[PDB]
Design a protein around this nucleic acid. Structure first.
Ligand SMILES: Nc1ccn([C@@H]2O[C@H](COP(=O)(O)OP(=O)(O)OP(=O)(O)O)[C@@H](O)[C@@H]2O)c(=O)n1
Ligand SMILES: [Mg+2]
Lengths: 1004, 418, 218
DNA sequence: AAGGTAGGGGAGGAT
DNA sequence: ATCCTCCCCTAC
């Protein structure tokens, strides 16, 4: 019986069962019920010494148990690490038991189910029908999965059904309340297994007069009296509010594969559930496949706290309590956890997601025609835009002008759209689907048929936009890949973080290598150091800077050093420089480099002067294999990215390989996390120490290197930086570049992984040829092992402000002088989400002007600082008196949470008082907008005493009164410091602050 | 809501109260308990204080100098001695008052201290006085035991205790110089008696009365002389021939007195002590007076030795021998010497058995290069001579060859001793 | 004793001065839901909803919080049973009797113990049901519990499955204990020692301990 | 159920 | 002045 697995879920009744939802080639849905067991791992001595007999058990083989606790010694009398080998058993218990000596108790029971039965969560098995027992229509019970899922066949595709929904509720002057405010519209996008899409909107007829309803029907609307007259193939249906909700529950109770909403767990489904209960005695009832449970829809809350002590909560999500084998997926929490925005709102997400560049095809008097095709933008951008233009009502031009669509014509390859736009002095414009331009609160005061039909168009768009975002972010591909990578149900892929998702492959490794990890002592954490960060040699370079970055440093450091809790031989410490030397001489003979690596760390205790960790590299440990698994997966998705040609395939595969980078890096992080099963203080700090040494090695050999007439001379001797090695060390290496090349290399910065290597040329084509040559020689002759670097880009017009703040123009390694460089901002106010939109515009203007004057080169006297400072004051004073810039340019966004000491923090106070009075509630993980607002009847203030007293939170209906203005003093002070810190004059800058602000400036 | 959680709270409650005298090994445990208390209940009524000093003054009163009159009551009198004051708490180390630190005391003394505190748990901490490298137990601070039973037990276990007096007083008893003299002569103790303390039956609070005079003296020289095994004490000598008693080196170092100056002295009936109203000078001048080959061993003075095989055998409590190879057989005859020979490295043993200080000796070794062949020191030198300016460091540096000779010898015996 | 006017039954609330600075929101909140809530039969009757508001908060140290009042025979007073014939109070009295030795009694009422304020998180439920009005009291229950929390030092909740996220509902940290409700299987209420834990925590917070035996009436 | 350190810039306070 | 602490957010 060929089936493809769709989902796994657990019941929660008196008995616990695990259900599989899978679909046959022909579309038939089959549910299989499995018994749910508790899993325990015990030794043979324990297995035979249990008074209550076990229900079932199977041998696990002969596993080695290693005590991976860490101790320090002051001499070399190190004893063997306590280890034993014994027969192990895996015990299955229908009911929870407590066994005095049961190990591997940090693993989930669902993980044991998958692994000890050979089941892949997303496999496509050909099930053996002699074990399945029919218990209901299309539902089987399986008492033996080991002999049922034995055979897997190649993957095949299946149909899936979807429901996308949105609602609109009456709004007076407050957030809609289920006790007062009726629902006006409900829209669905109904997709069945056949692929047929039905788009329809329901209109509440009880808000229209008899004449308005009569015209609605005569103008082509259906008017249904009850649920049994509903027709899903009609675009518009009018009915009473009770019918609206009875249709809503008839659809929600269906066994869809996905029911997809945007922030509908807190509002959409919550309103429908509560409003129905108030009006009629009806419930939304879910049933299990075998009809042994029935539960009512009731949205519940799951909180996320921080990992510290007195800390509070820092996020919250809402979940559906269904038991019918349906995934109620909510885009709101998904995007917030996997996206970077100033705010996570449906309009802001679309504004960034669905955009393209279009050309003006034909100008008019009250219309402007745009054309978009593969000839105006990157391949696939015109197609993505054209798809959303089908339902879209407004198109935004250059992120500023919101135009209403007058005509639309979708072309075979692109689109033509006619917008209501004033004449603009250009030909090429950015189009995106962003914020609309309507006031619903007023439309509910003059409510009529034409408004009711106007709203219907917006509601169906919001229901379809969920589908376009669903495909845009490739949710289905990410879900299946995650379920296979971490062996867990598809429904749980996006709920868990590192501490849990690492345990899937970890359990496989422990069982394949036959290892048990145990502890007997108390864990104590100490601080340890981090990566090596260089200070910038200059600020503005005006030269090409080559970036040579280690492919994957820390994961490869842990593999090279075989850094794992069970591989450490020991830590030797000394209190004085007499015994330190004795220990060093003995270590060089007891632990020969060919088998051991010696890592010279910084002491953890202040009374120690030396701390040396010895790792045995002969037998590969558990962490190196865990890292190899995640590194291999990332390489596979990077390879597929190279073959992605559309605009959505590239984004999806780039996201996939990024995720695996973070997971492999989390494997490192969990080693320094005190509450991790993998915690190892010595191993985590040894990884960092080796990392620092590799950065210093690469920087040294490159800094001072000279490319000459047919050969490259490295600055230092190319020796192994850790131990004595048999590789060549001659710093002279033959090159394949023309003998006419005569260059010198320097090093201007570097942080943990990459080295910024400066060359004395400005051409961006010779820089690529030379950099590629360095890449070959460095990987083959400078580096000595599994470490490799990649050439990523040529930075041009690099300007650095501080160690971790710089901007540049990026010419990628795979480009040339005929390509357009990217604009890169790292760490600066241009990318920070807690600055402004006003600051960003001016800092870009003046920073560019400064770069151009210094690049051109004049240095008449002190003109550079004088012209910039005088111009800055003009603009700052002009805005203060003109006050023409809208408030939306001076708003900041900040995340709410309760992670404060002394709970009376101004941030908790501001939000708490907001929540108590404003109908809009800010949740514990929500980002809110705020601004600094002051009375309009006060002068320019030079001496600022209290800032926290001007903060206010901006809601959806926040309009300044005649007695309010923007607190320009705080916005201007921050901008001025950022601009003036760029200058290199010690007299004009200081006098500038004294005149404009009267404050003491800070410089870096 | 479990009994385990109740226990952890009671442990925090007991240790929160038992502060200011149990600071040897307690702060790390206290920090753990309060971090647990807040983690499992979200709030705890403690401030996580980590800078707790040592101070037991809440158990005592101010010093009474005036001739006051307390006529009724049952009193126990103790001849409080002159010296540095230490306390010893339950399962803790010896700690000095005023500045919390750790001290090494003889193992026989610490064992007896544990025996009386294990015999009965009604004692919060013991009180000790130190003078001339002699430990005496004075007055145990308790809730359930009168100042009688600790003296009976301490004597049996082997601790020094004063003779105490008990009397029920009904007749007029005015405190004055006359009564002070009568009382102090009635205890039959030999150690210098600085004051007399009394406790009233039924009250735990201590009171102390001190009758003393002042004397104006002129110091001519300060000498250093031996009391024990390479342990010396200062003796301040005035132009009249009289001596001013000093308990330790710290007193003269902090008082900033110099030879050929006038000082105030606290005069008692049988002795007098220097009254308290720039560090290198006072240390070097006292040493110069008695000889260059002396250093300051923390609390005491110690002379430079002439260390060799004979001294090593005397400190390891084994028979004298002439060849270093004889040590292996003279150490395995008993089972009691091994305790200090096998349990510590060569560096530590050679420091303690030759008379080197702790803080200053590490400072010297951490500024010194060594040439070591086959785990034997053959050469050394100094990287930064600015560490040698301290008189204590120069004295041990100039004789460092003695450390090297023994250091190699101790390595040799371990090679075959194991 | 002041009062406010309510648009629906009981048409008035009488309260102690200590509750005055939350009455403004309580009136607005109740007047939003009373027209829906009062359509059915409730436990207790509407005139008993706001009966614990006639209670000073300045002499309270520990709060004993339930989830809702008895499905039947409610008096408005949490945990109160005029005949001591309800499972919840039986186990509450039994557990403390084991600790104190007081076994000869006719009843046990938490409202007479010094420093104890018993409280029902939800002020009412549907007659014969439990947790049935969670939607009606959501706004009010949050406000009232926070007001008590600002006064007491130790919040004692009954039910680990119901108060697991109580930390999310309070802005003022309180020394929270969550135990078992005195109604579940396996007699898990009487296996806790929360009565002594509370007094130990109070001593750590420099507060007078509670003599829990004061609740016994004979 | 809960990954790690390095570092800049800003607000408020205790001197 | 003048440094210290806390925090928000970013680079790895
Ligand atoms: N969350 C993160 C991030 C980084 N890092 C650390 O920063 C090092 C360099 O960061 P990186 O160069 O951006 O990441 P990478 O491993 O080199 O991957 P690459 O892009 O293929 O070169 C990483 O090796 C460490 O993983 C850490 O700890 N956690
Ligand atoms: Mg890298």
């Amino acid at each position: 019986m060929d089936v493809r697995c769709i989902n796994w879920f657990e019941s929660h009744g008196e008995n616990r069962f695990l259900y599989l939802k899978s679909r046959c080639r022909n579309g038939e849905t089959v549910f299989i019920r499995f018994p749910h067991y508790f899993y325990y791992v015990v030794t043979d001595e324990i297995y035979q010494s249990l008074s209550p007999p076990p229900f079932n058990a199977r041998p696990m083989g002969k596993m080695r148990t290693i005590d991976i606790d860490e101790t320090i010694s002051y001499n070399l009398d190190i004893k063997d690490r306590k280890c034993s080998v014994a027969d192990m058993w895996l015990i299955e218990e229908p009911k929870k038991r407590s066994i005095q000596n049961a190990t591997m108790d940090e693993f989930f029971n669902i993980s044991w189910f998958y692994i000890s039965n050979g089941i892949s969560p997303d496999g496509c098995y050909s099930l053996d029908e002699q074990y399945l027992t029919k218990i209901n229509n299309g539902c089987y019970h399986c008492d033996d999965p080991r002999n049922c899922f034995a055979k897997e066949i190649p993957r095949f595709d299946i149909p899936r059904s979807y429901l996308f929904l949105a609602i609109a509720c009456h709004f007076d002057k407050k957030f809609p309340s289920v006790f007062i405010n009726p629902i006006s519209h409900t829209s669905y996008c109904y997709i069945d297994l056949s692929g047929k899409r039905l788009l329809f909107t329901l209109i509440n007829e009880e808000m229209l007069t008899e004449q308005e309803i009569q015209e609605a029907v005569d103008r082509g609307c259906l008017r249904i009296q009850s649920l049994m007259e509903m027709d899903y193939e009609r675009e518009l249906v009018l009915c009473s509010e009770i019918v609206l909700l009875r249709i809503a529950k008839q659809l929600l109770e269906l066994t869809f594969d996905y029911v997809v909403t945007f922030n509908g767990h807190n509002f959409d489904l919550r309103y429908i559930t509560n409003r129905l209960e108030l009006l009629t005695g009806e419930k939304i009832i879910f049933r299990s496949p075998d009809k042994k449970e029935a539960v009512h829809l009731c949205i519940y809350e799951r909180n996320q706290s921080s990992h510290k002590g007195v800390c509070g909560m820092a996020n919250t999500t809402f979940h559906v309590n269904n038991n019918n084998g349906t995934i109620f997926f909510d885009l709101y929490s998904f995007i917030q956890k996997s996206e970077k925005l100033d705010s996570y709102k449906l309009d802001s997400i679309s504004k960034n997601a669905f955009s393209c560049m279009g050309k003006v095809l034909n100008r008019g008097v009250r219309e402007m025609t745009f054309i978009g095709d593969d000839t105006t933008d990157a391949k696939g951008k015109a197609d993505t835009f054209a798809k959303v233009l089908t339902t879209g009502n407004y198109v935004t031009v250059d992120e500023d002008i919101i135009c209403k669509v007058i005509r639309k014509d979708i072309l075979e390859n692109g689109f033509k759209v006619v917008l209501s736009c004033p004449t603009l002095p250009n030909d090429i414009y950015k189009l995106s689907f962003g914020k609309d331009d309507i006031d619903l609160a007023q439309m509910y005061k003059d409510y009529n048929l034409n408004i009711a039909l106007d709203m219907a168009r917006y509601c169906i768009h919001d229901a379809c936009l969920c589908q376009y975002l669903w495909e845009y972010y490739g949710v289905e591909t990410k879900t299946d890949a995650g379920a296979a990578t971490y062996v867990l149900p598809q429904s749980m892929v996006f709920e868990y973080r590192a501490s849990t998702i690492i345990k899937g492959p970890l359990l496989k490794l422990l069982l394949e290598t036959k290892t048990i990890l145990v502890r007997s002592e108390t864990k104590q954490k100490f601080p340890y150091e981090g990566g090596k960060v260089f200070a910038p040699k200059q600020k503005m370079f005006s030269n090409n800077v080559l970036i040579f970055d280690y492919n994957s440093l820390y994961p490869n450091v842990c593999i090279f050093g075989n850094l794992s809790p069970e591989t450490l031989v020991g830590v030797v410490v000394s209190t004085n420089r007499l015994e330190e030397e004795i220990n060093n001489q003995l270590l060089l003979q007891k632990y020969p480099p060919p088998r051991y690596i010696t890592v010279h760390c910084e002491p953890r205790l202040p009374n120690l002067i030396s701390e040396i960790a010895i790792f045995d590299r002969s037998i590969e440990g558990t962490i190196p294999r865990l890292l190899r698994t995640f590194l291999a997966e990332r390489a596979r998705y990077k390879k597929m990215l190279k073959q992605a040609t559309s605009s959505t395939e590239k984004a999806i595969y780039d996201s996939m390989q990024y995720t695996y980078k973070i997971v492999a890096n989390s494997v490192y992080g969990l080693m320094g996390f005190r509450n991790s099963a993998l915690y190892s203080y010595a191993s985590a700090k040894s990884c960092t120490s080796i990392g620092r040494r590799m950065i210093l090695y690469l920087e040294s050999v490159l800094n001072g290197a000279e490319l000459s007439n047919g050969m490259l001379r490295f600055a230092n001797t190319l020796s192994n930086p850790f131990y004595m090695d048999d590789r060549d060390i001659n710093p002279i290496v033959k090159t394949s570049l023309p003998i006419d090349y005569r260059f010198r290399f320097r090093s201007v910065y570097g942080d943990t992984d990459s080295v910024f290597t400066e060359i004395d040329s400005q051409d961006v084509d010779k820089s690529i040829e030379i950099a590629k040559e360095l890449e070959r020689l460095i990987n083959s002759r400078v580096l000595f092992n599994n470490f490799k670097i990649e050439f990523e880009a040529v930075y041009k017009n690099l300007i650095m402000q501080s160690k971790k703040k710089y901007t540049t123009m990026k010419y990628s390694a795979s480009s040339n002088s005929k390509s357009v460089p990217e604009r890169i901002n790292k760490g600066t106010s241009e990318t920070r989400r807690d600055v402004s939109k006003f600051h960003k515009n001016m800092i870009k203007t003046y920073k560019t002007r400064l770069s151009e004057m210094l690049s051109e080169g004049r240095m008449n006297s002190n003109q550079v600082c004088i012209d910039i400072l005088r111009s800055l004051e003009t603009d700052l004073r002009s805005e203060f008196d003109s006050r023409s810039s809208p408030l939306e340019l001076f708003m900041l966004s900040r995340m709410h949470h309760s992670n404060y000491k002394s709970a009376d923090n101004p941030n908790m106070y501001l939000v708490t008082e907001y929540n108590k009075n404003n109908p809009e509630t800010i949740e514990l993980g929500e980002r809110y907008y705020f601004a600094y607002i002051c009375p309009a009847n006060v002068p320019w203030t030079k001496k600022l005493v209290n800032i926290k007293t001007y903060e206010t939170i901006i809601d959806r209906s926040f309009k300044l009164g005649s007695n309010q203005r923007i607190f320009y003093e705080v916005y201007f002070k921050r901008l001025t410091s950022e601009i003036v810190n760029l200058l290199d004059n010690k007299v004009l800058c200081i006098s500038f602050f004294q005149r404009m602000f009267g404050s003491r400036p800070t410089f870096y | 809501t479990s009994s385990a959680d109740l226990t952890n709270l009671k442990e925090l409650l007991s240790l929160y109260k038992s502060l200011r005298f149990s600071d040897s090994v307690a702060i790390e445990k206290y920090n753990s308990l309060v971090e647990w208390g807040t983690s499992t209940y979200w709030k705890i009524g403690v401030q996580k204080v980590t800078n707790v000093e040592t101070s037991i003054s809440d158990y005592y009163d101010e010093v009474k100098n005036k001739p006051f009159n307390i006529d009724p009551g049952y009193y126990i009198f103790l001849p409080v001695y002159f010296g540095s004051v230490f306390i010893y708490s339950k399962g803790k180390n010896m700690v000095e008052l005023g500045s919390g630190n750790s001290f090494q005391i003889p193992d026989e003394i610490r064992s007896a201290c544990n025996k009386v505190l294990d015999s009965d748990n009604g004692i919060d901490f013991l009180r000790f006085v130190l003078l001339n490298n002699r430990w005496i137990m004075e007055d145990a601070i308790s809730k359930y035991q009168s100042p009688v039973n600790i003296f009976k037990l301490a004597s049996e276990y082997g601790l020094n205790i004063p003779n105490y007096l008990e009397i029920e007083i009904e007749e007029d008893t005015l405190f004055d110089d006359e009564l002070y003299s009568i009382m102090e002569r009635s205890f039959d103790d030999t150690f210098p008696k600085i004051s007399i303390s009394y406790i009233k039956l039924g009250e735990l609070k201590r009171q102390v009365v001190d009758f003393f005079k002042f004397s104006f003296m002129y110091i001519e020289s300060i000498k250093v002389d031996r009391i024990g095994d390479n342990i010396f004490i200062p003796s301040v000598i005035t132009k009249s021939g009289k001596k001013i008693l000093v308990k330790d080196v710290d007193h003269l170092i902090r008082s900033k007195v110099r030879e050929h100056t006038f000082v105030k002295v606290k005069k008692k009936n049988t002795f007098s002590i220097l009254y308290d109203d720039t560090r290198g000078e006072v240390i070097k001048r006292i040493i110069d007076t008695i000889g260059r080959d002396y250093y300051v061993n923390g609390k005491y003075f110690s002379k430079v030795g002439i260390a060799g095989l004979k001294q090593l055998t005397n400190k390891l409590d084994i028979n004298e021998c002439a060849t270093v190879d004889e040590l292996v057989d003279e150490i395995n005859k008993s089972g009691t010497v091994k305790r200090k020979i096998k349990n510590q490295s060569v560096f530590d043993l050679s420091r303690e058995c030759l008379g080197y200080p702790e803080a200053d000796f590490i400072t010297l070794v951490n500024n010194m290069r060594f040439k070591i062949e086959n785990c034997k020191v053959v050469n050394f030198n100094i990287e930064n001579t600015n560490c040698l300016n301290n008189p204590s460091i120069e004295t041990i540096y100039g004789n460092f060859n003695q450390f090297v000779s023994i250091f190699n010898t101790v390595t040799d015996v371990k090679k075959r001793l194991f | 004793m002041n009062s406010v006017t309510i648009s629906h039954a009981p048409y008035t609330i009488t309260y102690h001065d200590d509750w005055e600075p939350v009455m403004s929101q309580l009136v607005e909140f109740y007047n939003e839901v009373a027209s829906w809530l009062l359509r059915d039969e409730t436990s207790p009757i509407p005139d008993k909803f706001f009966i614990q508001l006639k209670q000073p908060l300045r002499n309270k140290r520990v709060c004993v919080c339930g989830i809702d009042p008895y499905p039947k025979d409610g008096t408005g007073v949490p945990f109160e049973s005029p005949n001591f014939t309800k499972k919840s109070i039986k186990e509450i009295a039994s557990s403390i009797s084991r600790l104190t030795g007081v076994i000869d009694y006719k009843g046990y009422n938490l409202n007479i113990i010094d420093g104890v304020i018993p409280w029902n998180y939800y002020l009412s439920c549907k007659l014969g049901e439990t947790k049935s009005h969670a939607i009606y009291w959501d706004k009010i229950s949050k406000l009232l519990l926070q007001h008590i929390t600002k006064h007491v030092s130790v919040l004692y909740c009954l039910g680990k499955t119901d108060f697991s996220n109580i930390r999310a509902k309070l802005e003022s940290p309180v020394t929270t204990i969550v135990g078992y409700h005195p109604a579940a299987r396996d007699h898990q209420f009487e296996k806790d020692r929360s009565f002594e834990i509370i007094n130990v925590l109070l001593e750590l917070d420099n507060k007078t301990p509670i003599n829990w035996a004061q609740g016994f009436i004979y």
